[PDB]
Amino acid sequence: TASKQSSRSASANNVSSTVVSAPELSDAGVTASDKLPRVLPGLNIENSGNMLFSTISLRGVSSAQDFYNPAVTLYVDGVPQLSTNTIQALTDVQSVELLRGPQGTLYGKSAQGGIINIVTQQPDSTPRGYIEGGVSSRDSYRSKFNLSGPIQDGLLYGSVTLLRQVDDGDMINPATGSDDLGGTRASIGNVKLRLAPDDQPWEMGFAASRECTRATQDAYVGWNDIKGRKLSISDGSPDPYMRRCTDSQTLSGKYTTDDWVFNLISAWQQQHYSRTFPSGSLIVNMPQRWNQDVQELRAATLGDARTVDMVFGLYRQNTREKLNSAYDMPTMPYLSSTGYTTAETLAAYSDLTWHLTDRFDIGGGVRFSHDKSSTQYHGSMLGNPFGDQGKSNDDQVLGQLSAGYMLTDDWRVYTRVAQGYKPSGYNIVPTAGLDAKPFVAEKSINYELGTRYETADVTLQAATFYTHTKDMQLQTLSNAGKADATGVELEAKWRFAPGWSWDINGNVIRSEFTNDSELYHGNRVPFVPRYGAGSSVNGVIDTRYGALMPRLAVNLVGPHYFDGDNQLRQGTYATLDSSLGWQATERMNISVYVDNLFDRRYRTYGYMNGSSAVAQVNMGRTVGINTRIDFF
Numbered sequence: 001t002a003s004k005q006s007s008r009s010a011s012a013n014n015v016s017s018t019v020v021s022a023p024e025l026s027d028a029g030v031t032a033s034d035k036l037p038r039v040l041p042g043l044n045i046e047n048s049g050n051m052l053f054s055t056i057s058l059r060g061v062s063s064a065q066d067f068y069n070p071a072v073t074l075y076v077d078g079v080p081q082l083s084t085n086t087i088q089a090l091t092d093v094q095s096v097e098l099l100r101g102p103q104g105t106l107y108g109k110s111a112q113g114g115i116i117n118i119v120t121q122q123p124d125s126t127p128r129g130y131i132e133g134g135v136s137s138r139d140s141y142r143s144k145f146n147l148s149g150p151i152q153d154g155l156l157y158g159s160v161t162l163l164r165q166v167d168d169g170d171m172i173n174p175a176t177g178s179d180d181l182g183g184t185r186a187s188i189g190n191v192k193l194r195l196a197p198d199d200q201p202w203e204m205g206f207a208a209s210r211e212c213t214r215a216t217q218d219a220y221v222g223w224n225d226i227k228g229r230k231l232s233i234s235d236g237s238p239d240p241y242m243r244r245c246t247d248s249q250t251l252s253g254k255y256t257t258d259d260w261v262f263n264l265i266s267a268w269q270q271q272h273y274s275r276t277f278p279s280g281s282l283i284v285n286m287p288q289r290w291n292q293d294v295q296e297l298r299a300a301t302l303g304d305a306r307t308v309d310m311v312f313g314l315y316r317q318n319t320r321e322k323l324n325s326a327y328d329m330p331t332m333p334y335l336s337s338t339g340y341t342t343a344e345t346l347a348a349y350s351d352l353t354w355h356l357t358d359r360f361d362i363g364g365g366v367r368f369s370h371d372k373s374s375t376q377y378h379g380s381m382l383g384n385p386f387g388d389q390g391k392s393n394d395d396q397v398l399g400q401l402s403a404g405y406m407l408t409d410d411w412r413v414y415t416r417v418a419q420g421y422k423p424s425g426y427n428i429v430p431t432a433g434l435d436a437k438p439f440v441a442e443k444s445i446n447y448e449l450g451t452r453y454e455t456a457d458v459t460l461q462a463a464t465f466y467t468h469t470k471d472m473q474l475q476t477l478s479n480a481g482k483a484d485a486t487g488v489e490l491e492a493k494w495r496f497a498p499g500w501s502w503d504i505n506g507n508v509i510r511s512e513f514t515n516d517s518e519l520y521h522g523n524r525v526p527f528v529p530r531y532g533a534g535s536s537v538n539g540v541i542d543t544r545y546g547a548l549m550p551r552l553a554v555n556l557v558g559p560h561y562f563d564g565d566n567q568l569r570q571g572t573y574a575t576l577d578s579s580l581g582w583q584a585t586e587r588m589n590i591s592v593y594v595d596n597l598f599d600r601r602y603r604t605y606g607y608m609n610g611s612s613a614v615a616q617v618n619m620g621r622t623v624g625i626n627t628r629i630d631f632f
Contacts, residue, residue: 001019001097001119002017002075002078002097002099002115002117002119003015003099003106004078004106004298004300004311004313004351005300005301005309005310005311005351005353006300006301006302006303006304006306006309006353007303007304008303008304008306008309008353008355009309009311009351009353009363010309010351010352010353010361010362010363010364010400010402010404011106011351011353011363011365011400011402013361013404013412013414013452014361014363014402014403014404014414014415014416015099015100015101015402015414015416016099016100016101016448016450016452016461016463016489017097017098017099017100018040018041018097018098018100018461018491019095019096019097019098020039020040020095020096020097021094021095022093022094022095022121024039025039025090025093025096026132026628027538027549027551027579027581028536028551028553028577029577029579029593029595029626030090031089031090031142031165031167032087032088032089032090032165032167033045033074033086033087033088033089033090033116034046034047034054034087036096036098036116037555038553038555038577039096040096040098040116041489041491041505041507041534042058042059042100042489042505042507042532043056043057043058043072043098043116044056044057044058044527044528044529044532044557045057045087046527046604046605047087047217047604047605047616048063048067048605049217049218049605049616050215050217050218050242050275051087051184051213051215051217051242051244052084052087052242052244052273052275053067053068053083053084054067054070054083054086054087055067055527055605056070056071056072056086056113057071057072057113057527057528058071058072058100058113058114059100059101059113059114059446059465059467059485059487059489059509060467060485060486060487060509060510060511060525060528061112061113061420061444061467061469061483061485061511061528062113062511062525062526062527062528063526063527064472064474064525064526064527064564065473065474065564066473066474066477067083068083068084068428069083069109069110069422069473070083070086070110071110071112071113071420072110072111072112072113072114072115072116073086073107073109073110073111073115073116074086074088074115074116074117074118075107075115075116075117075118076117076118076120077118077119077120077207077250077252077265078117078265078296079250079265079267079269079294080107080108080110080292080294080317081269082246082269082271082290082292082319083110084244084271084273084288084290085211085244085246085269085271088211088246089163089165089186089188089211089213090118091120091144091161091163091188091190091209092120092121092146092159092161092190093118093119093120093121094119094120094121095118095119096116096117096118096119097116097117097119098114098115098116098117099114099115099117100113100114100463100489101114101416101418101446101448101465101467102114102398102418102419102420102444102445102446102467103115103418103420104367104398104399104418104419104420104421104444105349105351105365105366105367105398105399105400105418105419106311106349106351106365106367106400108315108317108345108347108367108369109345109371109421109422109423110422111420111421112420112421112422112442112444112467112469113420120192120207121148121159122157122192122194122205123148123149123150123157123158123159123192123194124148124149124150124157124194124196125149125150125153125154125157126149127148127149127150127631127632128146128147128148128149128631128632129145129146129147129148129149129630129631129632130144130145130146130628130629130630130631131143131144131145131146131628131629131630131631132144132626132627132628133626133627133628134624134625134626134627135624135625136167136622136623136624136625137621137622137623137624138168138169138170138180138183138619138622139166139168139180140166140167140168140183140622140624141164141166142163142164142165142166142167142626143163143164143165144161144162144163144164145161145162146159146160146161146162147159147160147631148160148192151193154197154198155195155196155197155198156193156194156195156196157193157194157196158191158192158193158194159190159191159192160189160190160191160192161188161189161190162188162189162190163186163187163188163189163190164186164187164188165184165185165186165188166183166184166185166186167183167184168180168182168183168184168185169181169182169183169216169217169619170182170229170619171219171221171229171231172229172230172231173219173231173233173237173239174230174231174233174235175233175234175235175236175237175238175239175278176238176239178216178239179229180216181216181217181219181231181239181240182216182217182219182619183215183216183217184213184214184215184217185213185214185215186211186212186213186214187211187212187213188209188210188211188212189209189210189211190207190208190209190210191207191208191209192205192206192207193205193206193207194206201255201256201257202253202254202255202256203252203253203254204251204252204253204254205250205251205252205253205254206249206250206251206252207248207249207250207252208247208248208249209246209247209248209249210245210246210247211244211245211246211247212243212244212245213243213244214241214242214243215242215243215244216239216240216241216242217240217242217616218240218242218275218277218279218284219231219232219233219240219277219616220232220606220607220609220614220615220616221614221615221616221617222612222613222614222615223568223603223606223612223613223614223615224613226601226602226603226615226617227601232614233278234278234280234281236330237278237283238278238283240276240277240278241274241275241276241277242273242274242275242276242277243273243274244271244272244273244274245271245272245273246269246270246271247269247270247271248267248268248269249267249268249269250265250266250267250268251265251266251267252264252265253265253266256302259301259302260299260300260301260302261299261300261301261302262297262298262299262300263296263297263298263300264295264296264297265294265295265296265297266293266294266295266296267293267294267295268292268293269290269291269292269293270289270290270291271288271289271290271291272287272288272289272290273287273288274287275287275288279609280609280610281329281330282327282328282329282334283328284325284326284327284328285324285325285326285327285328286323286324286325286326287323287324288321288322288323288324289321289322290319290320290321291319291320291321292317292318292319292320293317293318294315294316294317294318295315295316296313296314296315296316297313297314297315298311298312298313298314299311299312299313300312306355307354307355308352308353308354308355309352309353309355310350310351310352310353311349311350311351311365312348312349312350313347313348313349313350314346314347314348315345315346315347315348315349316344316345316346316347317343317344317345318342318343318344318345319342319343319344320340320342321340321341321342321428322338322339322340322341323337323338323339323341323428323429323430324336324337324338325337325338325379325429325430333380334381334382335379335380335381335382335432336379336380337377337378337379337380337429337430338377338378338379338430339375339376339377339378339379339428339429339430340375340376340377341373341374341375341376341377341426341427341428342373342374342375343371343372343373343374343423343425344371344372344373345369345370345371345372345423346369346370347367347368347369347370348367348368349365349366349367349368349369350365350366350367351363351364351365351400352364352365358406359405359406360403360404360405360406361403361404362402362403363400363401363402363403364399364400364401364402365399365400366397366398366399366400367396367397367398367399368395368397369395369396369397369398369423370393370394370395371393371394371395371396371423371424371425371441372391372392372393373391373392373393373423373424373425373426373438374389374390374391374392374426375388375389375390375426375427375436376388376389376390377389377430377436378430379430379432381432381433384432386430386432386433387430388435388436389436390426390436390437390438392424392425392426392438394423394424394440394441396421396423396441398419398420398421399418399419400416400417400418400419401416401417401418402414402415402416402417403415410453410454410455411451411452411453411454412451412452412453413449413450413451414448414449414450414451414452415448415449415450416446416447416448416449416450417445417446417447417448418445418446418448419443419444419445419446420444420445420446421441421442421443421444422441422442422473423441424438424439424440424441425438425439426438426439427439427476427477428477429475429477431475431476434476439471439473439477439478439479440471440479441471442469442470442471442472442473442479443469443470443471444467444468444469444470445467445468445469446465446466446467446468447465447466447467448463448464448465448466449463449464449465450462450463450464450465451463457494457495457496458492458493458494458495459491459492459493460490460491460492460493461490461491461492462488462489462490462491463488463489464487464488465485465486465487465488465489466484466485466486467484467485467486468482468483468484468485469481469482469483469484469485470482470483474519474564480517480518480519481513481517481518481519481520482513482514482516482517482518483511483512483513483514483517483525484511484512484513484514485509485510485511485525485528486509486510486511487507487508487509487510487511488507488508488509489505489506489507490504490505490506490507491503491504491505492504492505497539499539499540500537500538500539500540501537501538501539502535502536502537503534503535503536503537504533504534504535505533505534505535506531506532506533506534507531507532507533508530508531509528509529509530509531510524510530511524511525511528512524512525513525513564519564520564520565520566523561523564523565523566524560524561524566526560526561526562526563526564526566527560527561527562528560529557529558529559529560530558530559530560531558532555532556532557532558533556534553534554534555534556535553535554536551536552536553536554537551537552537553538550538551538552538553545582545584546582546583546584546585547581547582547583548580548581548582548583549580549581549582549583549591550578550579550580550581551577551578551579551580551581552576552577552578553576553577553578553595554574554575554576554577555574555575555577556572556573556574557572557573557574557602558572559571559572562603562605562606562607563606563607563608567608567613568606568607568608568613568615570602570603573600573602574600575595575596575597575598575600576596576597576598577593577594577595577596577597578593578594578595578597579591579592579593579594579595580592580593587629587630587631588627588628588629588630589627589628590625590626590627591625591626591627592623592624592625592626593623593624593626594621594622594623594624595621595622596618596620596621596622597621598621599620599621600618601617601618601620602617602618603615603616603617603618604616604617604618
C-alpha cells in the first residue's frame, strides 16, 4: 500500500510493516511526526538540539553524528521530505505506514532503518469536515479546521485545512527571565484540488501548503539537573530563536488500465529558516535555505490473480542548499562562512514478484542510481581565509530479495535481503583548513527472517535480523566506521471483546561498532535503546450519557548513549499515558488526557561542551482537554 505495487507482491508481504489509521493517531495524541513512536513500535525520534535535526532511529540503525542525512526518511505521498522538515505537524493524514528494514530499492537514499510514509487524504464526492480544538499544560493549545468535498461534482473536488498548534515549554533563561522557552508554535495551511472526471481512467492532483513554525530551543540544562528548569545560559545572552517556513507544491497524475496503473508525480519544496542561539560565550547564527524538487514516474501491474506482479520506476530528485554561519564572541568574530552545496539524482528501478505455488513466492528488485553533488564555500576562522569548491558523481546499485511460504491460510513466514545507502557527496557545513574531497557512500545491508499471523481478531508479527553498515559518515565529515545491528522484534494486537483491543510490543537489539572500526570501535551505536517494549489497551464502554472510550498506554525505553564515545548514557525509563473520550452528542466528542502520568523525566539528547556534559530533557507530564465537532 506504500510498497508502490500490488497488495499481493513480494515487497508488500515479505516485510515487517505497520499501518496506523487516522482515528488511531488521534486516540494516541499523535499530533506531529515526533510522536509517531507512540504508535510505531521500534521507532525512536528525538530532537538533537532542535526541531530541524532529528535523531530518528529504527532497527538499531541511526543517524549518528550527521543530522542532515537520517537512516529513516519521511515520505508524504511518496514525496521525500527535506531532512530539516521531518519533524512537522500532521495536518490531514489518512494513515501512516512504516516499513522496517532497508528500502533502498523502492525509495532510495537515506532508507536504511526504514521509511515512514504519510498518506494524505484525497477529497472526494462525499462532503467531509471537522473542527478539533484543545488546550493543555504550559499554556499549550491546538486548533484545526478542515473542509473537503465536491467543487463541481463528477469532476473537481477540493479540501482545505488550517492548523495552529502550540506545544509550549516552561524553561527559563536566567539572562532574560523568560519562562516559556523550549516549545514550538506552528501555523499551517493546506489546499488540495483533485480532478477526477466521472467516467474516465485518469485523475490529477494538486496540493499546496505553507507551514511557519517558531521554536525557542537550542538550549540545554546541566547533565545531572534533569528536573530543573533554569537553562545553562550565561548572563548577557539573549533567548534562542528560530523560525522556519516551508512551502510545498505537489502535482500528481494517475492512469488506470485493465492490467496496469501508471502514476506520475512532481513535487517542489522550499524552506528557509533563521536560527540563532547562545552557546557559552558565543552567539551562533546559522540561517539556511533549501530548495528540493522530485519527479517520479512509475508503471505497476494491478491486480491479482497473476503469476508475476511488477513495478517499474524513474525517479529524479534535485536539492540545493545554502548556509551562512556566524559564530561570534562578544567583542569580535570567531568564525564566519557561506556555502552552497547541491545534490541531484536520476534513478531507474524495478521490483518483480513470482508466485510459483499458490502458497510460495520469490521476489526481488534492483535500483540503478546516478548521484551528482557539488559544494562551494568560503569563510574565515580567527581571521584566516579559507574556502574551496568541487563537483563529483558516483552511481550505486541496490537490491532486494525475498521469499515467503504461507504455512497456513493466514500464517506466513518470509525472508529478506535488502540494501540501503546514503550517497557519496559533500560536507554540508564548511570546515576551515581541510580541502573539499567528497566522502563515499555509506552502505547498509540487512538480512531478515520473520513471520506474520493475521486472523480477524488477531495480528501477530515477529522478526529477527542483522544489518551491517559500512563506510559510515561520522571538524570533518569523512567515512570511517562500521556497525553491526542485530536483534528481534515482536508486535501483536488482539481484539478480545468487540470495541476493545490490546496492543503489545517489544524489541531487543544490540548495535555496536565493529572491532575493526576506524572510530568508537566496540562501543554501542548511539540513539539505539538496548531493548524497548510497550503495551496499550483501549475500548468503548457504553452508557446512558453517551459512549465513553478509555485508553491506557505504557511505554518502556531501554538504556542508550548519545555519543560515539559512550560517555553520555540515558538508561531505562517508562511512561504511562492515558485518556478518556466521551461522545457527548452524536457529532461532538470531548476528551481529557494526561500523558506521562507519573511526571517521569529523562534525557532527550546530550553532548559534551568542553568538559561539561549538557542535556535536553523531556517536558514532563501534560494534561489536556481536546474536543472535536465534525461536520455533515
